[PDB]
Design an enzyme around this catalytic site. Structure first.
Site, short mmCIF file in Angstrom:
data_model
loop_
_atom_site.label_atom_id
_atom_site.label_comp_id
_atom_site.label_asym_id
_atom_site.label_seq_id
_atom_site.Cartn_x
_atom_site.Cartn_y
_atom_site.Cartn_z
N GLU A 24 0.83 -1.20 0.00
CA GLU A 24 0.00 0.00 0.00
C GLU A 24 0.87 1.26 0.00
OE1 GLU A 24 -3.46 0.12 2.63
OE2 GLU A 24 -2.98 2.19 3.20
N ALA A 125 -19.84 3.23 3.94
CA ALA A 125 -19.17 2.59 2.80
C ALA A 125 -20.12 1.72 1.98
CB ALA A 125 -18.00 1.74 3.30
C1 LIG Z 1 -7.31 -0.92 4.81
C2 LIG Z 1 -7.82 0.48 5.03
C3 LIG Z 1 -7.63 1.44 4.04
C4 LIG Z 1 -8.07 2.75 4.21
N1 LIG Z 1 -7.86 3.65 3.20
C5 LIG Z 1 -8.27 4.86 3.35
C6 LIG Z 1 -8.04 5.80 2.27
O1 LIG Z 1 -7.47 5.56 1.20
N2 LIG Z 1 -8.51 7.06 2.53
C7 LIG Z 1 -9.16 7.47 3.68
O2 LIG Z 1 -9.54 8.64 3.76
N3 LIG Z 1 -9.38 6.57 4.69
C8 LIG Z 1 -8.97 5.34 4.52
N4 LIG Z 1 -9.19 4.42 5.52
C9 LIG Z 1 -9.84 4.90 6.76
C10 LIG Z 1 -11.31 4.50 6.92
O3 LIG Z 1 -12.15 5.27 6.05
C11 LIG Z 1 -11.76 4.88 8.33
O4 LIG Z 1 -11.49 3.83 9.25
C12 LIG Z 1 -13.21 5.34 8.44
O5 LIG Z 1 -13.34 6.03 9.68
C13 LIG Z 1 -14.24 4.23 8.36
O6 LIG Z 1 -14.47 3.89 6.97
P1 LIG Z 1 -15.17 2.53 6.58
O7 LIG Z 1 -15.16 2.26 5.07
O8 LIG Z 1 -14.58 1.50 7.48
O9 LIG Z 1 -16.68 2.85 7.00
P2 LIG Z 1 -17.96 2.02 7.45
O10 LIG Z 1 -17.88 0.62 6.97
O11 LIG Z 1 -19.16 2.79 6.86
O12 LIG Z 1 -17.83 2.07 9.06
C14 LIG Z 1 -17.94 3.31 9.79
C15 LIG Z 1 -18.77 3.20 11.06
O13 LIG Z 1 -20.19 3.17 10.75
C16 LIG Z 1 -20.80 2.05 11.35
N5 LIG Z 1 -21.79 1.55 10.41
C17 LIG Z 1 -21.58 0.78 9.30
N6 LIG Z 1 -22.67 0.49 8.63
C18 LIG Z 1 -23.67 1.12 9.35
C19 LIG Z 1 -25.07 1.20 9.16
N7 LIG Z 1 -25.72 0.63 8.15
N8 LIG Z 1 -25.78 1.90 10.07
C20 LIG Z 1 -25.13 2.48 11.09
N9 LIG Z 1 -23.83 2.47 11.37
C21 LIG Z 1 -23.15 1.77 10.46
C22 LIG Z 1 -19.68 1.06 11.64
O14 LIG Z 1 -20.05 0.26 12.76
C23 LIG Z 1 -18.50 1.99 11.94
O15 LIG Z 1 -18.38 2.35 13.31
C24 LIG Z 1 -8.73 3.10 5.40
C25 LIG Z 1 -8.93 2.14 6.39
C26 LIG Z 1 -8.48 0.83 6.22
C27 LIG Z 1 -8.69 -0.18 7.31
#
Ligand SMILES: Cc1cc2nc3c(=O)[nH]c(=O)nc-3n(C[C@H](O)[C@H](O)[C@H](O)COP(=O)(O)OP(=O)(O)OC[C@H]3O[C@@H](n4cnc5c(N)ncnc54)[C@H](O)[C@@H]3O)c2cc1C
Ligand SMILES: Cc1cc2nc3c(=O)[nH]c(=O)nc-3n(C[C@H](O)[C@H](O)[C@H](O)COP(=O)(O)OP(=O)(O)OC[C@H]3O[C@@H](n4cnc5c(N)ncnc54)[C@H](O)[C@@H]3O)c2cc1C
Ligand SMILES: Nc1ncnc2c1ncn2[C@@H]1O[C@H](CSCC[C@H](N)C(=O)O)[C@@H](O)[C@H]1O
Ligand SMILES: Nc1ncnc2c1ncn2[C@@H]1O[C@H](CSCC[C@H](N)C(=O)O)[C@@H](O)[C@H]1O
Lengths: 596, 590
Positions: A24, A125
């Site tokens: 990465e 997401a």
């Molecule tokens: C491998 C990896 C790569 C990353 N790359 C980047 C990058 O390139 N750029 C960047 O800016 N950030 C990046 N991040 C950071 C990431 O975006 C953060 O951890 C962010 O705060 C959460 O994003 P997520 O896609 O996990 O969100 P989600 O999956 O949407 O999770 C966020 C929160 O919402 C909650 N949630 C999920 N679905 C629901 C629902 N239906 N109703 C209510 N609550 C819900 C979950 O429990 C969680 O607490 C990366 C993280 C990882 C692990």
């Protein structure tokens, strides 16, 4: 081998039992940083990563055409570096029209893997997963993030799992996790997902400690606590980054080895922070770095989905593969096997004719002033020899050649110096080779254990007087040498039989059919010579004022010289092209008795 | 040179070229249909230009009977690679009928149709008309000519002959007098027809030949020539020698001072001796590929094949005839269709040339053990006669004599065949010899040709088991495939892709790799390879006999196997592969 979806490669190595690794990276904020990152891409590809990644943030205008954008770095990886590539993308502060636009652009440029992210302050997401599927169907492979100790904003740890479940069910193909410190953490997290019904691959992410900054970095990246264990060993050496990285390596090795031994992990995702040393030594100690890396072909492969069948090219763009890809990118199919089994070469806007280097450096190398054509001859001579010019500057490039010579040119350095010094100005060449082992370090390529072949090649600009003498000499060589002369006006002559292409590099490999990746094509040559001649003016001649004597000379050469390519068909015999030139020099000088 | 008959006609003779011709009659008996195809293969050696098959509505020439005019000519093209003219007559036949025949001609690949009146709504004329309307151009239809003329007067008939030029050329009747039709030549230029003329020639080969001249020619042989055949005894051999000498002389000044269309009468000897005597018979040309190009137009681009049918080219054509497109360049990137099945082993044009009485004498009128069979393989390769004085002309798999390249490894083959390695195919390795090499050359001149060593052979289950062991230590260098009649197989071919084993590098051109070893194709070949044990050898013997049992036992249990040595610049290691296998089958223990 296998030109298949990422998730197809992954379940293959799954069933096969082969562990893999990925890398990465983050888009730099300046051009020089971008340029150096691409160089690392090329160095670390030699290890055999299953895939690499480019992160995404809205403060960096990541969807733009700026050279430092997530989109242009990913695109470079795929189209120039040939790598399987994952573009991250976040949907915090974005609308439908914006996201759909970015997805279309990544599809056009050849991307085919998206990691679907929320981002930090479309609400989750999953909305982006569900959206990619409805708007692009199944075209993209999709991955999504997971958190071994639970996401911080989540209430119940148990509830975070149910959410993960839903976005995976919405259409994701595998999970990449946040960094952790104890194998056991990954393991329980995996069994939680297994018991939830999550059935896709879960790749653990590994963050190597590479110095003192690493501690503050990984807490910013993850919002975890760094353990006193690591802290207590590091705080004594708080000011010795070198010593720290050997401890990071010991830690990473031990962790991964405990993961790999699990059998419930199919691969390893390393957070590199755009740095090479530490991650390479961790992978080599694990046995996952490729032992005898081979160049697949004599030219670098594209990973664009439309261009998976190409395995033969004309030799003329060998130093300008970016121009070749640009001029061919509207093609519906690409030649496979033989060239001659034909869409036209596309035309060009000027930014591909411009040099990377600033005007003042070129002038120091090519000459602030020229006094005659012989001034030009010495610039080619010095490009080849490596010595300094009379103002103390090495010549590191020519308008046609912006990199250093390949290794093969060392086989013929003195011969090349001889002809450039007499006004045969070369821009491309290759030695003949009569079936050397395919593992040879100067000319090898393709699978191991076979035999590689080349016909000798030579390509060059020369005056009308010299070309006219060359043609007379070529009569004694009619059956042995193939020849093509053309000027900027398009007058040309060639003994190519029925204007057919001629294979000049090829390889015979155990258990396989033949690969002939390089040919001399008279039709392609007539499109190539339009660039070759334009580069005289666009990079060299414009360095001088229009009325200057230096411009008159360059312009003269452009308007009068011939471009010439020659091939010696008898590869089992010594290269005869040097004697062709000597015969020409004798003919030019036939009335002067002091050269006979 | 792969162009139509019109372009294939005017291009030679202008540039100091003259050509052959040969006319045949469709046979009356099956045994005659096979004899004629064989005679087609032999006389194709004489580097002819074009061949010709007669037509007559009494012999149902448009049908699918093996004796029909159109099948003979379809075979000529599809299985013999000769460019052919199918005669056609309009005598009394409905408008629809001639159309259906024309449909089959081009459909079967036929390109050169010749229109002729038929001797009992049209008469002589309406030949090009019917065709032309649905003919096209430069397809090369040709019309008949009788120089000394016969039914009418030359005012309309001799007017109607050069009038029918609208028709790339015409064919002239027998010319009994030397330069008798020579008066026809300049007078034919006066007729105004802008097409060339093709002259006849008719030999004497027996007593009952003479009378045949009056019946087909409707002319009378000169008194002089009859004054020499009456003294010609009842020894038709006598009369014959004088016939070829009468001939070579006649056209001798005629070929230059003026192509020669020779009326074979389905006989070879005389028409050949006159050929090499006239200076127009090539006996040793360069081969364009290791295998012979099909004449069909749809196989225009075919330039690579599996090595498995090298001795059975006509079966390969038969099993590939349904294919729309043909592999060009590499085999594996042409996504080939399935091979068609060979169910009929008695096709007149694929059967063996030897009758059953001959095969018994050479292969054994009885077999007593499996070793009885080994010895027959050994004799085929050596050329020596068997115990009863008969040389072994052929095998179930190999109906012709060895190619020259096998002399490079004759003694090695004799050693393994004696030990129960029963070979049916091989080639030596070749590291870059001149493309004009007499033993292994092919392709354009001035280039270089290459071969990986190859070996294919039947052997017992016990030998196959031990060979597998030995191959463990050749894994990186030798590609192998084994299979039995039931279909159990094993190969180390990577990803089941094909392996190139012959290729050439030619000046100013791209690479040509005409022969591969392909594990998919090999599964289709093996069905045919095994079936030849029963169909060619086994059924020589009574169904209940001990001989048939031995053949049956081999067919039911032996494996077929092919081996390639990838290291073409090094000495063939396949002979050491076998020695080690035979070592491992012996009980030393120290
Ligand atoms: C491998 C990896 C790569 C990353 N790359 C980047 C990058 O390139 N750029 C960047 O800016 N950030 C990046 N991040 C950071 C990431 O975006 C953060 O951890 C962010 O705060 C959460 O994003 P997520 O896609 O996990 O969100 P989600 O999956 O949407 O999770 C966020 C929160 O919402 C909650 N949630 C999920 N679905 C629901 C629902 N239906 N109703 C209510 N609550 C819900 C979950 O429990 C969680 O607490 C990366 C993280 C990882 C692990
Ligand atoms: C090389 C060759 C091959 C042959 N092959 C065969 C074969 O396979 N099968 C077979 O049965 N026979 C064959 N024949 C014989 C041929 O069919 C006979 O000669 C037949 O009787 C007519 O031949 P033709 O093609 O010249 O006829 P046409 O061209 O139809 O007849 C021309 C002759 O008849 C006169 N004529 C006829 N109708 C007209 C008209 N309307 N107006 C003016 N003049 C006219 C012309 O003056 C001239 O003499 C062959 C002959 C030759 C020379
Ligand atoms: N100015 C110059 N004069 C002669 N050769 C040059 C040159 N600049 C670059 N080259 C050489 O041209 C070659 C282009 S790669 C040549 C073809 C390659 N061997 C193949 O199989 O496709 C390199 O060997 C490079 O070092
Ligand atoms: N019974 C037999 N055992 C071994 N070789 C045989 C054989 N019968 C025929 N052959 C040889 O098998 C070969 C088939 S032709 C081989 C193909 C050739 N190398 C190419 O480039 O295409 C001929 O050389 C032929 O002489």
């Amino acid at each position: 081998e296998r030109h298949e979806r990422l998730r197809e490669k992954m379940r293959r190595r799954l069933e096969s039992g082969d562990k893999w690794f990925s890398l990465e990276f983050f888009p730099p904020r300046t051009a020089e940083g971008a340029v150096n990152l691409i160089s690392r891409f090329d160095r670390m590809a030699a290890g055999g990563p299953l895939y690499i990644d480019v992160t995404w943030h809205p403060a960096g205008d990541p969807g733009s055409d700026k050279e430092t954008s997530s989109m242009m770095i990913a695109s470079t990886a795929v189209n120039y570096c040939g790598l399987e590539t994952i573009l991250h993308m976040t949907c915090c502060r974005q609308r439908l029209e914006e996201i759909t636009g970015h997805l279309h652009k990544a599809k056009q440029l050849g991307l085919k893997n998206i990691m679907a992210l929320r981002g930090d302050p479309f609400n989750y997401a999953v909305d982006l997963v569900k959206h990619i599927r409805s708007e692009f169907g199944d075209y993209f492979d999709i991955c999504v993030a997971g958190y071994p100790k639970g996401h911080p904003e989540a209430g119940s740890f148990e509830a975070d799992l149910k959410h993960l479940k839903e976005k995976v069910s919405a259409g994701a193909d595998f999970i990449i996790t946040q960094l952790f410190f104890e194998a056991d953490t990954f393991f329980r997290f995996v069994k939680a997902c297994t018991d939830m019904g999550i059935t896709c691959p879960i790749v653990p992410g590994i963050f190597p400690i590479q110095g003192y900054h690493s501690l503050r970095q990984l807490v910013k990246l993850s919002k975890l606590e760094v353990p006193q264990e690591i802290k207590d060993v590091i705080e004594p050496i708080k000011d010795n980054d070198a010593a720290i990285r050997n401890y990071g390596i010991e830690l990473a090795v031990s962790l991964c080895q405990e993961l790999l031994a699990s059998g419930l992990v199919p691969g390893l995702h390393f957070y590199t922070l755009n740095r090479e040393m530490a991650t390479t030594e961790v992978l080599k100690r694990l046995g996952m770095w490729t032992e005898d890396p081979r160049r697949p072909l004599p030219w670098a492969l594209s990973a664009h989905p439309k261009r998976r069948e190409e395995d033969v090219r004309p030799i003329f763009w060998a130093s300008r593969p970016k121009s070749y890809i640009y001029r061919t990118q509207e093609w519906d199919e690409f030649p496979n096997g033989r060239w001659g089994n034909f869409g036209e070469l596309k035309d060009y806007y000027l930014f591909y004719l411009k040099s990377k280097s600033p005007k003042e450096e070129l002038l120091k190398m090519w000459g602030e002033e020229l006094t005659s054509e012989a001034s030009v001859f010495e610039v080619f001579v010095l490009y080849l020899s490596g010595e300094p010019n009379r103002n103390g500057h090495k010549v590191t490039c020519l308008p046609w050649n912006d990199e250093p010579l390949a290794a093969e040119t060392s086989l013929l350095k003195e011969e090349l110096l001889r002809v450039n010094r007499q006004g045969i100005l070369t821009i491309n060449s290759q030695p003949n080779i009569n079936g050397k082992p395919s593992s040879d370090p100067i000319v090898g390529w393709g699978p191991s254990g076979g035999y590689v072949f080349q016909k000798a090649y030579l390509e060059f600009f020369t005056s009308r007087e010299t070309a006219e003498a060359l043609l007379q000499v070529l009569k004694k060589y009619e059956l042995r040498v193939n020849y093509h002369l053309v000027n900027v006006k398009g007058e040309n002559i060639t003994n190519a039989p029925e204007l057919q292409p001629n294979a000049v590099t090829w390889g015979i490999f155990p258990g396989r059919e033949i690969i002939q990746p390089t040919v001399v094509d008279p039709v392609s040559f007539m499109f190539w010579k339009d660039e070759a001649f334009a580069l005289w003016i666009e990079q060299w001649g414009k360095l001088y004022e229009e009325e200057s004597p230096s411009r008159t000379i360059i312009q003269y050469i452009h308007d009068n010289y011939f471009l010439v390519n020659l091939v010696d068909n008898d590869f089992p015999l010594d290269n005869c092209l040097w004697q062709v030139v000597e015969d020409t020099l004798e003919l030019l000088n036939a009335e002067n008795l002091y050269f006979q």
